[PDB]
Design an enzyme around this catalytic site. Structure first.
Site, mmCIF file in Angstrom:
data_model
loop_
_atom_site.group_PDB
_atom_site.id
_atom_site.type_symbol
_atom_site.label_atom_id
_atom_site.label_comp_id
_atom_site.label_asym_id
_atom_site.label_seq_id
_atom_site.Cartn_x
_atom_site.Cartn_y
_atom_site.Cartn_z
ATOM 1 N N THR A 35 -3.005 27.719 37.097
ATOM 2 C CA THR A 35 -2.339 26.661 37.910
ATOM 3 C C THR A 35 -3.010 26.712 39.342
ATOM 4 O O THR A 35 -2.762 27.657 40.072
ATOM 5 C CB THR A 35 -0.816 26.876 37.979
ATOM 6 O OG1 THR A 35 -0.267 26.853 36.656
ATOM 7 C CG2 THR A 35 -0.159 25.776 38.798
ATOM 8 N N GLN A 36 -3.834 25.732 39.654
ATOM 9 C CA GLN A 36 -4.472 25.793 40.965
ATOM 10 C C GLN A 36 -4.476 24.382 41.415
ATOM 11 O O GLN A 36 -4.457 23.480 40.545
ATOM 12 C CB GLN A 36 -5.865 26.416 40.855
ATOM 13 C CG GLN A 36 -5.864 27.859 40.375
ATOM 14 C CD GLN A 36 -7.258 28.450 40.303
ATOM 15 O OE1 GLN A 36 -8.209 27.888 40.844
ATOM 16 N NE2 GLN A 36 -7.381 29.590 39.633
#
Lengths: 243, 233, 233, 198, 212, 242, 204, 245, 222
Positions: free
Chosen positions: B1-2
């Site tokens: 998750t970025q």
């Protein structure tokens, strides 16, 4: 005290040689493989009138095409068999086919070298090599009827006849002359009974001897006490008529 | 998750009959602020491969260290013959792509899209793609980001099939590359004025031109002004 | 006394080496004899296989580790399996991670470390089995000698097993001849058979006994076993 | 759900536990079990998930029978009940709780008194003369408080339980086609085959 | 997908659908939805294709292992129950199945044990599992009887499936029929819903007493 | 952690720890087992060097695995307890998973298996006790008697004895049992067991313990008088003259 | 459903002169339906009394933890725990269970039997230590209960007079609730005799 | 080497005994005497305090008498130090049965958990075993009073009267004669003391070379009061029985 | 949020003869309306008369095929030069997918070849695991368009000779490999018109008893 990393000045470990002495303190076990079928025979032995020899056995099923006869410390082979069966079932799941006799002997022999007091590449989950040797016979439809001698050392040999146990030197010599690949399944059993009686220090009857066979029409089938007896009478009569 | 907080844009590349060319501006964006210019996007690996990275600068610095490890360990246990068994384009590609594929599969992603370009000293031309999505492909022309949109149709006109390849010599190919970049600087502002241009020649190895700036300028548009956003009271 | 320096693996003796290393070294010789020769384009291994009996049959001791990589052993079968499994994982990773076919030099150094490590414990032990590891990559064919001590030497021809020296002296003679027979599968096989016979002095040279293995310029790892060596005798 | 009723009369513990699983219009099965014999003098009823039922039961049975053989005396209804409560009191704190609420009927044979313990899936254990789970109790406690007063025979209880179930199937729209009823007493555990007014 | 199994005098009659579809036009009319645990035992595929295919085979291996180990034929009850215990641990993992583990043993008879992803293992002599199950149970119930001969029992299954295929479009390409006897199952063939429909409409007259 | 070895393979072939284990069986208690057609009786002699004990708050030498499975031992108390603990978990475990109590054969394999395993690993050495495992399979009535020893070996026997002065009572069985007739009379099976222990206990007829297992959770300790009655009868046999 | 108000419950403690008193309801409910007229929410280990109101599953698990802690401590020191020491033992156990999802309101009551002080002390959901000795209230109706105690209570009272206070105070707060009917008990404690008086009160 | 420091003294001998275990049995004979009398009305426990200085205090009589639970107590023959490790683990063993089933632990179980633990150390871990014997005095309503003893081999037995420590044999011989099927606590108090006087390895007998407790039915509760008599309360009792000397 | 999953083009078609079998796939790779490649295979030889293709999303399919190629390697090594058949592989492949439905794959896999029987088999997997026996199976994006034509011309289902067209049919009978490739070409040539997930080139790997034969036909290029 002692360790288990010790070699001899040859370069062959102590415990391994001592394991070969234990096999010879077992009883004679004979396997002969011929064109049709593999025959495996054992001495059940009966040493007392109170012993139930007809409720025990020494010829154990690995799978529905693979049997084994053992000689040695017969407890130590329960661990080995249990592991082999787990391997044998897992192959039936993974590819839906027969497990090669050879692929299995190899798997089992890998864990016969697993003795140590811990090292940095491998798990040790035994302290000492098993006291027990195997004849594993089977059938696959890739190289047919086969026989293998599984060492506790971890070496694995392909054979056609082999005897293990205390009398294996005398039985193997007789076997070398008798072995032909033009012998029927029934014949192999009769020649096995003749020799098995010889090496025996006591009378040969069903109540101390067990036959078993591997056919590719019905797999490993352990033969009945009765069927093997019937042939013992027939052996006795032919033999006492050429005299 | 970025969540991307920084971007680098544009690497375009093509093959010609005797090599490959790849060029890229030098860019560290913080959105629309051209925060850093002096962020190299073309990291030459040996002298027959160039690794071109677009996407997030934060992932890019991490990879920049791994790409330098890749050189180092290939001199380890191989002392000599390091251009017959080391620093080959296929290896560079494969090394990088395994780390990429694993990072995206565990939900901690390497947010780049990468072109690995070369001429193999064991082979012929190399141009192979990898992205954050894990998809990989080869094509005669490859471009990432905004250049994937805009540049690559120009480049495809030069080579798009084996037949179109003999019809592109050194001169024509280098002219295409220079033309493409200028299109990128013109119609996207994220692209920096400053670029690097590298030619990896089947005879000459890696010839790398540094600190180039886009030229043969468009200013034509200023003639045709009528307003487009101008208000009148 | 003796029992001090055999009974421990995390020791050393006054000579500059522990006794256990002397016994492991002896154990390689206790193997059956095998020669290895190369001209540096192809590499061949010719091996005499003995079986225990007329009622035993031969089991494999030339091991395909990849379709470009293999080994022969001489020494201890149990140990040889452990090492072969390691080299096989090692071959697989080299392909998956780097697109490499693995050089012998890189493989040897890695096999060394594990060996070292198991003398850095009680209840671990040297292997006591030696291997001639061959493969054909991009620097050509290669022949390595691995010893369970961790000594890795690349030799142009060599032998391990009982009466190594017989083939080895034949090899130092025929050297100059074989290295200039480049590009020939059949000339080198013929050589291997000739070589192995200078080892022999108490053993028979027969079709079923002998076993040949090749990898080379235009040959991926293919074994001749049993029948299929008759025509090179 | 599955509707599970209990009454402790002076002699016995009577538990009423559903005898049908209804899918739409018709009974897909009407032989279904909602109670498991924990011990010769311990019986346990359940309602919740049907599969949470079996798992819980078979665990609890196995632990209690290990204890029983080991200690050479079957455990008391009070020990067993506390035991069960405790297990529920872990699982509630974990990610998957067991979600079956039970009525445990036991006869303490060593002293000779009946006992009922009603244990929620929360792991709330309470002793009562009568109880119910769900919506049930709102109608049937009004019947119970009024028409029943402690110390009446086992036979009067079967007819009380019938009145409860009749009101429940009528006025509540729940369908479960009554109960099969079981008695835990000094004589142990018997299924009462009749339900015609019992 | 509608799958049913019922107990009667000569064993169990197991009847199932088969259908694979390309749009609503039926592309192929034959598949498996019996997973062959072993020769004596069946477990049926419905309510999660992969979960059934993989784990019933895996269950099949614990069965083969037990039959070697102890020299003992596994019970239908013990096989189901081993699976059920484990399953509830993998419940939350996407794991879904709705199946009947059917066997016909010498010790326990024809036995059908109903299993879902919950740790559920339930006894009953008549089961239907599916989505057309309610209607299929209707046909079955009104014609049910343990004392039915083998031939009419086989049609009962086939017709109950047919009925369930007409109203719900997830079944009907062919119906496959299997009869479990104690030495293992004997197939009673694959029957085209097209041909079969016409026969049933006239013949059964149930939902059709005045032909519709 | 720790995992240095305590099992070391003998140049005998028979490990040190197995051979020293067997010695532990001879010092301990005496246990004997006789099968019927309908029973299996397990007899033990009590030896109390001094007695200030009771017989009801001492732990008794025939120990329940189950309502209908017993395990009997010779050897040290301490070791045998460990074998028992593991078996009571195994009893329940089969009951949980197969929905049926243990087969006797599987349990025997199990008690053997733990012993065998402690011979095989380092860091553990094997147990000083040999056991008599008896019981009944589900839907069955035929007695099962198996004998397990610290080597991890087991085998079936129609009659057996283990512990102190095994030799004398084995012989005594060889001449007082029939293989065309295991006695189908509960009374003669108890009778033989009482004769066997009588010849060793020295004194006392309430220092004899019988435990009878008949089918279907019938484990029964016969009481003092019943035991006295066979002992009376044995002196009438011994002071017989024509 | 509700976090702690499924079964309800309220608890009151008061200070006097060589006496304290602690009182509780006997309700157990299942939502707003009162189920039972018995459920004892006050327990004691010797001369320390612990009432914990809230959800019953959580009062039970805690009660067994403090019983354990006290028993084993009693065994080692060869004497009972003190009100003062037990309040310390509670804070920490509760601060261990703040991270866990418990829903409790403990209140601690006793008389020190060798320092000669009445002692009461309070605890919450958060599990913070409250040093006051007058009254401490806890439970559902804690808001009504403080309003009432603060007017009705007068400092330093003989046992009889403490009874009249506690009883009426509870009874009238309870009458504005349905979650606090189904019978009630009052305990009047001296450290050498305890009187239990059941009250007769409303239900739904 | 690691195994070249090992001596393997944890293994079965050529006589089939365990070296370290046999040595622990010895230890117990060099520590004080402990005597357990079970009557059907109480249990009388004494343990003998050896090496008694005047600057040793006599205000303590809990230092070989330990309550493991509020119905189970032991008398220790052995060390304070060996005992203490097991004592804490016993007390914990108590709380586990209590929390789960909400009732008192059986003695027969609690004893087994200690013995299995002792047994464990000599099989596995390379450890020494504990050199300690316990005489367990406890009550159940399934068995009345129970009295057990456990010893260093992991073997445990039930006794209705038992002696452990120095001069075990001699005490036991006296015990066997004076024992009678009929019991009362106060009769048992006389019995214990008559014997104790004759087993001492020092002339006569004094109250301080004793530690004492009785288990009577109630004295501030319904039943089952453990009273540990302090040195001066023992002094009074030696005159009361009529062993005034 | 973040999905590594996207979409990738491809269409594949597996056809079982009764002495031949083919596994065909187009070579187009797209993401959205950009061209990723006009020639990258989705069709692979894993060897031994096993042809294998994982059509759908590219990142998963490649990873699945490589993974399977290491299982080919391990089988030959540990079991001493033993051939793996399509079924045996099918089961192996099933176990990999179900192994990793805990981080989902998004492919329509098909394996094809010839049995040790000698007659064709085509096996089809779903994204979540599971396997099934087929005759013929179109997979990927134009699967739904190809399959209706295919049932008629290959499988002769919903295909009838004029008469009563219910008792008179074009029967199911032996087929020839050339006319089948002609059919395969037609299916893809109809597909490129109606799908843009198909285009550029067609690689058919045709599996016979004389080995593995490759054929290449070109398709439309934009």
């Amino acid at each position: 005290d002692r360790g288990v990393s010790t070699f001899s000045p040859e370069g062959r470990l102590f415990q391994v040689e001592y394991s070969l002495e234990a096999i010879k303190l077992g009883s004679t076990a004979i396997g002969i493989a011929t064109k049709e079928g593999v025959v495996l025979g054992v001495e059940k032995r009966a040493t007392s009138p109170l012993l139930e020899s007809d409720s025990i056995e020494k010829i154990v099923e690995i799978d529905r095409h693979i049997g084994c006869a053992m000689s040695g410390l017969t407890a130590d082979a329960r661990s080995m068999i249990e592991h082999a069966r787990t391997a044998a079932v897992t192959h039936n799941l993974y590819y839906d086919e027969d497990i090669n006799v050879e692929s299995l002997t190899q798997s089992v022999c890998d864990l016969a070298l697993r003795f140590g007091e811990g090292a940095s590449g491998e798990e040790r989950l035994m302290s000492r090599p098993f006291g027990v040797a195997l004849l594993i016979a089977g059938h696959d439809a890739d190289d047919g009827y086969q026989l293998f001698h599984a060492e506790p050392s971890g070496t694995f040999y392909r054979y056609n006849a082999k005897a293990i146990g205390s009398g294996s030197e005398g039985a193997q010599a007789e076997l070398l002359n008798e072995w032909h690949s033009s012998l029927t399944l029934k014949e192999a059993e009769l020649l096995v009974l003749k020799i098995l009686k010889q090496v025996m220090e006591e009378k040969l009857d069903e109540n101390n001897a067990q036959l078993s066979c591997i056919t590719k029409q019905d797999g490993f089938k352990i033969y009945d006490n009765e069927k093997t007896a019937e042939l013992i009478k027939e052996l006795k009569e032919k033999e006492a008529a050429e005299s | 998750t970025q969540q991307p907080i920084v971007t680098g844009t544009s690497v375009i590349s093509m093959k010609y009959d005797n090599g490959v060319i790849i060029a890229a501006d030098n860019l560290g964006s913080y959105g629309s602020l051209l925060r850093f210019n002096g962020v190299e996007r073309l990291i030459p690996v040996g002298d027959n491969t160039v690794v071109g990275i677009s996407g997030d600068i934060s992932d890019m610095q991490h990879i920049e260290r791994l790409l330098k490890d890749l050189v180092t360990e290939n001199a380890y246990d191989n002392p000599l013959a390091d251009a017959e068994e080391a620093l080959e384009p296929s290896y560079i590609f494969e090394y990088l792509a395994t780390v990429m594929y694993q990072r995206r599969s565990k939900m901690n992603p390497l947010w780049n899209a990468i072109i690995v370009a070369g001429v193999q000293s064991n082979g012929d031309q190399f141009l192979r793609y990898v992205n954050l999505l894990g998809v990989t492909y080869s094509s005669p022309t490859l471009a990432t980001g905004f250049g994937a949109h805009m540049a690559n149709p120009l480049l495809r006109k030069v080579v798009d099939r084996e037949s179109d390849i003999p019809k592109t010599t050194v001169q024509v190919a280098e002219e295409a590359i220079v033309n493409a970049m200028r299109v990128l600087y013109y119609r996207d502002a994220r692209s920096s004025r400053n670029f690097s241009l590298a030619i990896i020649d089947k005879n000459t190895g890696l010839t790398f031109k540094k600190n180039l700036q886009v030229e043969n300028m468009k200013w034509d548009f200023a003639k045709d002004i009528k307003g487009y956003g101008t208000q009148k009271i | 006394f003796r029992n001090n320096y055999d009974g421990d693996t995390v020791t050393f003796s006054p000579t500059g080496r522990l006794f256990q290393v002397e016994y492991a070294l002896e154990a390689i010789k206790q193997g059956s004899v095998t020669v290895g020769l190369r001209s540096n384009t192809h590499a061949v291994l010719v091996a005499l296989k003995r079986n225990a009996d007329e009622l035993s049959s031969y089991q494999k001791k030339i091991i395909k580790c990849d379709e470009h990589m293999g080994l022969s052993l001489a020494g201890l079968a149990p140990d040889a399996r452990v090492l072969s499994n390691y080299l096989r994982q090692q071959c697989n990773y080299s392909s998956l991670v780097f697109n490499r076919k693995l050089a012998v030099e890189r493989a040897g150094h890695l096999l060394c470390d594990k060996a070292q490590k198991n003398t850095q414990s009680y209840g671990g032990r040297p292997y006591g089995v030696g291997l001639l590891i061959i493969g054909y990559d991009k620097s050509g064919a290669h022949l390595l000698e691995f010893q369970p001590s961790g000594n890795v030497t690349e030799l142009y021809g060599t032998a391990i097993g009982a009466r190594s020296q017989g083939a080895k002296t034949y090899l130092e003679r025929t050297l100059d001849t074989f290295i200039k027979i480049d590009g020939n599968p059949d000339e080198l096989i013929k050589a291997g058979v000739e070589a192995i016979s200078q080892s022999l002095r108490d053993e028979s040279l027969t079709v079923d006994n002998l076993s040949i293995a090749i990898v080379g310029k235009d040959t991926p790892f293919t074994i001749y076993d049993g029948e299929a060596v008759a025509k090179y005798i | 759900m599955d509707i599970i009723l209990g009454i402790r009369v002076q002699d016995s513990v009577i538990l009423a536990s559903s005898k049908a699983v209804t899918r739409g219009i018709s009974v897909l099965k009407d032989s279904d079990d909602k109670t498991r014999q924990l011990s010769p003098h311990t019986l346990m009823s359940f309602a919740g998930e049907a599969g949470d039922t079996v798992q819980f039961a078979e665990y609890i049975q196995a632990n209690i029978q290990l204890y029983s053989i080991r200690e050479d005396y079957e455990l008391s209804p009070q020990a067993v009940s506390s035991f069960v409560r405790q297990e529920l009191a872990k699982s509630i704190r974990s990610r998957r709780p067991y979600q079956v609420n039970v009525l445990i009927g036991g006869y303490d044979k060593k002293k000779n008194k009946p006992e009922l313990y009603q244990i929620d899936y929360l792991g709330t254990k309470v002793e009562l003369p009568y109880g119910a789970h769900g919506y049930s109790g709102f109608y049937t406690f009004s019947l119970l408080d009024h028409h029943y007063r402690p110390d009446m025979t086992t036979e009067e209880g079967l007819d009380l339980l019938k009145l409860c179930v009749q009101e429940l199937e009528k006025r509540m729209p729940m369908d479960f086609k009554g109960v099969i009823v079981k008695i835990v007493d000094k004589d142990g555990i018997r299924q009462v085959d009749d339900f015609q007014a019992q | 997908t509608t799958t049913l199994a019922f107990r009667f005098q000569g064993g169990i009659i197991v009847a199932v659908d088969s259908r694979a579809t390309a749009g609503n036009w039926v592309a192929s009319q034959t598949v498996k939805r019996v997973i062959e645990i072993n020769p004596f035992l069946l477990g049926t595929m419905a309510g999660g294709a992969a979960d059934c295919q993989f784990w019933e085979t895996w269950l099949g291996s614990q069965c083969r292992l037990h039959e070697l180990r102890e020299k003992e034929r596994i019970s239908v009850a013990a096989a189901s129950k081993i699976l059920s215990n484990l399953v509830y641990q993998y419940k939350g993992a996407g794991l879904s199945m709705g199946t009947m583990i059917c066997g016909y043993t010498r010790k326990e008879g024809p036995t059908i044990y109903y299993v879902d992803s919950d740790g559920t293992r339930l006894k009953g002599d008549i089961f239907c599992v599916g989505s057309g199950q309610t209607f299929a149970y209707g046909v079955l119930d009104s014609n049910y009887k343990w004392d039915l001969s083998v031939e009419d029992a086989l049609y009962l299954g086939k017709r109950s499936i047919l009925a369930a295929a007409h109203r719900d479009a997830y079944s009907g390409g062919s119906v496959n029929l299997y009869h479990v006897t104690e030495d293992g199952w004997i197939y009673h063939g694959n029957h085209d819903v097209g041909e079969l429909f016409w026969k049933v409409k006239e013949e059964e007259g149930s939902f059709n007493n005045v032909i519709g | 952690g720790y995992d240095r070895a305590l099992s070391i393979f003998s140049p005998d072939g028979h490990i040190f720890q197995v051979e020293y284990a067997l010695e532990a069986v001879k010092r301990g208690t005496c246990a004997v087992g006789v099968k019927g057609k309908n029973c299996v009786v397990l007899g033990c002699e009590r030896r109390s060097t001094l007695k200030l004990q009771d017989t009801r708050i001492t732990p008794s030498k025939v120990s329940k695995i189950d309502s209908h499975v017993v395990l009997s031992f010779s050897g040290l108390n301490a070791d045998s307890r460990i074998l028992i603990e593991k078996a009571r978990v195994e009893a329940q475990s089969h009951r949980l998973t197969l929905e049926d109590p243990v087969t006797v054969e599987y349990l025997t394999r199990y008690v053997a298996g733990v012993q065998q395993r402690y011979t095989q690993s380092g860091g553990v050495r094997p147990f000083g006790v040999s056991t008599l495992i008896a019981g009944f399979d589900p839907r069955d009535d035929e007695p099962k008697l198996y004998q397990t020893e610290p080597s991890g070996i087991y085998s079936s026997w129609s009659a057996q004895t283990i512990g102190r002065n095994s030799k004398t009572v084995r012989e005594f069985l060889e001449k007082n049992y029939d293989r065309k007739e295991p006695p189908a009379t509960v009374e003669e099976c108890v009778k033989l067991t009482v004769r066997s222990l009588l010849e060793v206990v020295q004194t006392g007829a309430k220092n004899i313990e019988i435990t009878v297992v008949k089918p279907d959770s019938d484990i029964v300790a016969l009481s003092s008088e019943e035991i006295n009655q066979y002992v009376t009868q044995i002196e009438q046999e011994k002071q017989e003259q024509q | 459903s509700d976090p702690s108000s499924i079964n309800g419950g309220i608890v009151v403690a008061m200070t006097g002169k060589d006496c304290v008193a602690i009182a509780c309801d006997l309700r157990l409910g299942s939502q707003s339906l009162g189920v039972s007229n018995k459920f004892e929410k006050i327990f004691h280990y010797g001369h320390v009394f612990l009432g914990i109101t809230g959800l019953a599953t959580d009062v039970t698990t805690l009660n067994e933890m403090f019983r354990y802690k006290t028993n084993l401590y009693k065994l080692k020191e060869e004497r009972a725990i003190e009100p003062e020491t037990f309040t310390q033992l509670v804070s920490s156990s509760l601060y261990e269970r703040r991270f866990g999802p418990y829903f409790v309101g403990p209140v601690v009551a006793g008389i020190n039997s060798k320092s000669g002080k009445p002692f009461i002390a309070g605890f919450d959901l958060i599990g913070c230590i409250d040093e006051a000795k007058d009254f401490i209230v806890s439970g559902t109706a804690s808001d009504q209960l403080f309003g009432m105690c603060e007017s009705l209570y007068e400092p330093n009272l003989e046992p009889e007079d403490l009874f009249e206070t506690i009883s009426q105070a509870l009874l009238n707060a309870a009458d504005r609730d349905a979650l606090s009917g189904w019978g009630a008990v009052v305990y009047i404690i001296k450290k050498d005799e305890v009187v239990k008086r059941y009250l007769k009160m409303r239900q739904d | 080497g690691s195994r070249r420091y090992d001596s393997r003294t944890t293994i079965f001998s050529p006589e089939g005994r365990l070296y370290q275990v046999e040595y622990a049995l010895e230890s117990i004979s060099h520590a004080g005497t402990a005597i357990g009398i079970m009557a059907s009305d109480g249990i009388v426990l004494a343990a003998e305090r050896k090496v008694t200085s005047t600057l040793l205090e006599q205000d303590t009589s809990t230092e070989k008498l330990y309550k493991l639970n509020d119905k189970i107590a032991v008398a220790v023959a052995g060390l304070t130090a060996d005992a203490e490790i097991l004592i804490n683990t016993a007390r914990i063993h108590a709380q586990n049965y209590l929390k789960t089933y909400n009732e008192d632990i059986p003695v027969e179980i609690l004893v087994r958990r200690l013995s299995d633990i002792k047994q464990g150390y000599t099989q596995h871990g390379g450890l020494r075993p504990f050199g300690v014997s316990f005489i367990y005095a406890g009550y159940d309503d399934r068995y009345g009073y129970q009295l057990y003893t456990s010893n260093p081999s992991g073997n445990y037995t039930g006794w209705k009267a038992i002696s452990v420590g120095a001069n075990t044999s001699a005490a036991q011989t006296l015990l066997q004669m004076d024992y009678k099927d009929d019991m009362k606590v106060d009769d048992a108090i006389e019995l214990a003391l008559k014997t104790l006087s004759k087993t001492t390895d020092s002339s006569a007998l004094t109250y301080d070379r004793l530690e004492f407790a009785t288990i009577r039915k109630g004295a501030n509760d319904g039943e089952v009061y453990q009273k540990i008599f302090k040195p001066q309360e023992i002094k009074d009792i030696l005159v009361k029985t009529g062993i005034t000397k | 949020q973040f999905n590594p999953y996207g979409d990738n083009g491809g269409t594949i078609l597996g056809i079982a003869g009764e002495d031949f079998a083919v596994l065909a796939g187009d070579t187009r790779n797209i993401t959205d309306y950009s061209i990723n490649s006009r020639y990258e295979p989705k069709v692979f030889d894993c060897g031994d008369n096993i042809v294998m293709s994982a059509n759908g999303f590219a990142a998963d399919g490649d990873a699945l095929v490589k993974r399977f190629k290491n299982s080919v390697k391990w089988y030959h090594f540990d079991h001493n030069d033993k051939k793996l058949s399509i079924n045996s592989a099918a089961r192996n492949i099933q176990h990999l997918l179900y192994g990793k439905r805990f981080f989902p794959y998004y492919v329509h896999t098909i394996i094809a070849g010839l049995d040790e029987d000698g007659k064709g088999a085509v096996y089809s997997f779903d994204p979540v695991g599971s396997y099934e026996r087929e005759q013929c199976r179109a997979g990927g994006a134009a699967a739904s368009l190809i399959m209706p034509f295919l049932d008629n011309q290959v499988n002769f289902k919903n295909q009838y000779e004029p008469g009563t067209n219910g008792k008179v049919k074009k029967p199911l009978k032996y087929l020839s490999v050339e006319e089948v490739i002609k059919l395969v070409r037609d299916s893809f040539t109809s597909a490129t018109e109606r799908h843009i997930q198909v285009g550029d080139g067609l690689e058919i790997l045709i599996v016979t008893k004389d080995g593995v034969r490759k054929e290449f036909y070109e398709l439309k290029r934009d």
